[model samples]
Target: SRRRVVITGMGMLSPLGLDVPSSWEGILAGRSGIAPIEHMDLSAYSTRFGGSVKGFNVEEYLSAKEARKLDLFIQYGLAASFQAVRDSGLEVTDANRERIGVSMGSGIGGLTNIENNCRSLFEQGPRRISPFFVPGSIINMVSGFLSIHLGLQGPNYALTTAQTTGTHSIGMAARNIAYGEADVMVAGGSEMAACGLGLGGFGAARALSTRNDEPTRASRPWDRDRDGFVLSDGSGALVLEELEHARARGARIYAELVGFGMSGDAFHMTAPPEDGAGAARCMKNALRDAGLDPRQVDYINAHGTSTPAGDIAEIAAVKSVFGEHAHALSMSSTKSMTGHLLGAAGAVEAIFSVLALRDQVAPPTINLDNPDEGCDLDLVAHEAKPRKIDVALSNSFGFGGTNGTLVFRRFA
Candidate 1:
């Protein structure tokens, strides 16, 4: 028999708001966190706005000196982990510490760090570069730092599946628990690439919205006018525990992570197939894994990044997977408000899906004022819609043709 997995806690550090409650409130209120980039100058870039994290101070989670040893992504990961652990009320006791683990990732870890250190090396020689450069910039450092700090010795894994990183980590962490390797796991993804090189690279690819004059409306997913996705920065973490373990501790179970599925388009590096075939298959697999019929799922937190093709393709995928029931379901893109958080998008969006199930309110697809053709599904546009969601699915499609789906059902 498989050991069941449930989410005991969730943490979010995103542009919508800091931590879970604040961010959840921002989502329900239809607030836009996409704004003019404040971390660096965007004068040269076509896209000037992003889902930038405002006032995220690392000292809140780490000492000033220790915080200096890590990059923004690591700091954000630590902050989110702290929030989730606290919320779950899980302690790293000696008895079960070895059965706890961390699985986290970043799509582009420390891009800003590499850019700055490289500049320093060229301008002032290698000796001028900070010694903490490598440690601060590596992708795996998040899991390393977290395991060391949290004293989790079970599994330390980090996946870099582009935007699907977090969902993959969450899915794999759950697998570890189901396989009886661990009783609890901290899993999610983080990103801090809202800097110059980050924005410039995406901009150069023509993958960013150029509505600089209207920053708030820049990430208009499913709208006819959307040109590209808005880049964002943040982190999200979830505490996954075995069913018996959670029940024994009397942990407040937010939701049961019943299904996780992934696939590859095998078609493009940066774009999903125009038909969203891979995406459709991924969602179908999730439903199959969950033993759910298309009509039974209530909501879908779409991977709608506001890009011209990705948005429409995701809608097509939904229609293909859900058939006629697609029209009966409430689907929304909180990314319409939170912008695109790259690798962190999956975890943050997954948490939003869980919140939807818990509150029975489908978060809105803000700025869906003008839905494009074929995006006819009820998007809960512009306002949160009250509805009983028994099971919710979150879709996360990334560059390199990677796709992931997670199904979370209310834990009654």
Candidate 2:
């Protein structure tokens, strides 16, 4: 029999908060974390607002000296992973350390850092660059650094699938446990790209909301007036363990990661087809993997980024997957509050899905005042709704046409 995997713990640093509880509370309260871009000068940028991580102190997770050697995204990832490990209460003795692994990633690692260093290279020459630049800016450093800090020695790796990074990381980590490769795994994604270059690039591509006047109302997923997604910064981590292994350690179970589905839309580089056929197949694959009927899922954490096309296309995909039952299932975009966390979106959303199942509530799609055409699903709009959520699915689509879906079942 294949081993079953269960989430023992979760932690995150988001635009909403520095950890899961605050973020969850903010989400359920229908709060908005998006605001004007204060950290970087955005006077010339078209999209001047975003969901930047606020009040984060990296020194709590590392020494100031050590923190200077790593990028912000890695620091966020490490902090979240530390929180997850602490939450899980997983003691790493020499015997058990080898059976533990880390799979953490970022969609765009150290963009701000890269921008600064490139400026340094051109203006001050290569000699001005810090020696830590390479290690600090790379995507795999989160996994590498966390493994070193925690002394985890098994199956250490990171994947870079743009926005799908977190879902795929967590999904693959569960697979590692299910296939006997590891007994426990720390998995997630992190990102800190809400900077000059990050914002400038997305703004240039017209992928961000230009509604700078009302920053909080800008991320209006499914709303007819929705403009575009708000770029954000954050990290999220989940500790996954084999069911028997977790039981042996008496770890408090959060949920069972029963299904993972992935697909690629060959139609576009950055946008899904209007019909969302690939997304439908992706959800179908997850349900098929979970051995579940379409109607069995009670909630969905949609990849509703508030972009004009994406919001409608996601609804179309849900309708195609769940049919008339799509009207029955409640779905919401936590991004409405947390903004588009890019690579970190999937991990943070996955945690929200688990918490929704745990608390028996669906968080709101805040600011969704007027649903666009075809956006007819029961999107938990404006306010959180307490409901029976036995099964929850989280969806994420990335820039390279990559898509991922994660299915979670409430643990009895």
Candidate 3:
């Protein structure tokens, strides 16, 4: 028999808010976290807006020395992890530390730190670079730092699959727990790639939206006028525990991670398959893994990044997976508010999906004034709707044509 996994705690540091409650409130209210880039100078770029986490003070969450040793991405991860561990209410004592693990991801880890250190090495000298440079900038440090900070001694791992990083990490963590390798796992993703190299690279490839004049109105997913995805940065973390273990400890259950699926499209590196066959297969596989039918899924947290090709392909994939039930399911992309969080997108959106199940509400897809003809699903547009949400599906696809889908169900 397959082991049951339950989500006990969630934490987030996003453009929408610093914590889960505030972020969910903003999402339900249809508030846009997108705004003019104020965290850094974007005057030279055509795209001037992004979903940046405002008012995050590292010192508040970490010691000054610890904060200085970590990259911004790692810091964000640790901060959210701190919240998740606390919320989980699981005492990771020395005796049980071996049963706790961590699995996190960051698509483009520490780009700002890399840019700074490289420039310093070139302009000043290698000796001028901080000794903590390498440790701070490494991708796996998201898991490493969190493990050390939380004293988790189990399978500490990290995934770096660009956009699908978070979902893949969570799925992997759930599998580990299901196999009895661990009783608890801290899984999520973090990203801080809104800097010079990050923006320049994506902008050069024309993957980001160039809606500089109107920041909030940008990121119109599934809309005819949709241009491209908006770059965003943040972290989201969740605590997953075995159902029996959680019940033994009287842990509060947020939701259950019922199923997950992954696929690869051999078509293109940056673009999804035109037919969306791989994505459709992923959704179908996830439903099968969950032992659920298409009609059972109540909501879909679409990976609608607002790109012209991606948005349409994702909708096509959904229709293929749901068929006639597509009309009954409500789908929305919170990226309309929080922009595209890259590696962290899946984790944050997973939190949103679970919250929707808990609250029986679906977040709106903002800026969806004009819908595309092919996108026929009921995308909760411009307003949150109160409805019974028993299950939610969250999708994430990456640059290498890697796709991931997760099925979350309400825990009664």
Candidate 4:
């Protein structure tokens, strides 16, 4: 039998809000975090709107020197991890430091920093580049910095599987604990890819919404008017503990992470399999891993990135996995409100899923008017709904044909 793992605490630094409470409230209220890009001059690009993190005061979460040394992505990770560790209330003294671990991930690590440093080296001189440039821009430094801050002397690692990074991180972390590699694990994903290169890369691929006149409604998942995903930046963190360890410590259990599944499309790097077979396998595997029937799931935080093909494929995947229950399940894409956070999307959405299980309120997929006929799930559209959510599934798929799904049950 697989060892049990449960979420003890959660944290987020999202475009919706700075921390978990405010973010969840915004999600429940159906607020759109997308807007005209103010973080940088997007006037030159075809797409001027994005979901950018607002009012983030790094000084409040990090020391002056420490914040300056890390890239924005790492800063977001550190801040969210700090909040998660504090919320977990786990005393990681010297005695138990080695028993804890960090498993974080980032899809595009420090694109802004890398772009700036390279530009500086070309414009000025190689000697002008700071010594901290490489360290700040590397993906693994997210876990490295957090482990140092929390004095966690265990297996510190980061996964970089594009959008699947977040779900994969949590899944791997739970497995590590279950296999006795660690007692507790701080796991999630972060991304700060809203800057020039980040936007330009996706924009060049024609993957971002170009509705500059209506930024708030640009990310319309499952809607006929949907253009493309709105690029966003943020971080999310969760503290996962061994079930027995958590119960022994009297820790607050948010939800039991019952299942995790992963798959690869092998068809296209940027597009999902045409029939959504890979995604179907991912969800089915997760359900099997959890030892639960498909009808048992009440809510799904979908990987509905508001793309034309992706949205339809996800709906098909749902139908393939749940069959008749697909019509009965309550599904929503918080990405409709939070925009697509890329690497961090799954982590933040997972946090929202756990909150839904705890609070019995399903967040809405904003701007779901005129839903496509093929995308026929009950996509709790435009308003939050009160529901009995005992079990929820969160799905995330990424570039390079990666797919990941996780199932969480309300700890009774």
> What is the per-residue lDDT of model 2 for residues 37-114, given as tens digits with 9 covering 90 to 100?
888788988888888888998888899998998989999999999999999999999999989999998898999789
The candidate scoring highest on lDDT is 2
lDDT of 4 by residue, 8-45 (tens): 98989988899999999899889988888877887899
Clashes of each: 0, 0, 0, 0
**What lDDT tens digits, residue by residue, belong to model 3 across residues 97-170?**
99999998999899989888899899988888989998888988878987887799999999999999999989
The TM-score of predicted model 2 comes to: 0.99
Query: Could you give candidate 1's per-residue lDDT for residues 1-412 as a string of tens digits?
Result: 6789999999989997889999999999999998888777778778778887888888788889889878889888888888999999997889998899999899989988888888999999989899899888888888899888888888888989888998888998988998899999999999998887888899789898898888889888999888888888999999999999999988999999999999999998898888899999999999988889999999999999999899989999999998899989999999889999888999999899999998999999999989999888998889999998999999999988999999999998
Q: Give the clash total for candidate 3.
A: 0
Q: Which 10 consecutive positions of candidate 1 have the poorest summed lDDT?
A: 38-47
lDDT of 1 at 96: 91
lDDT of each: 0.90, 0.92, 0.91, 0.90
What TM-score does model 1 achieve against the real structure? 0.98
Cα error of candidate 4 at position 332, Å:
0.7
TM-score of each: 0.98, 0.99, 0.99, 0.98
**How many backbone collisions does model 4 have?**
0
What residue pairs clash in candidate 3, if any at all?
none
RMSD of each: 0.9, 0.8, 0.9, 1.0
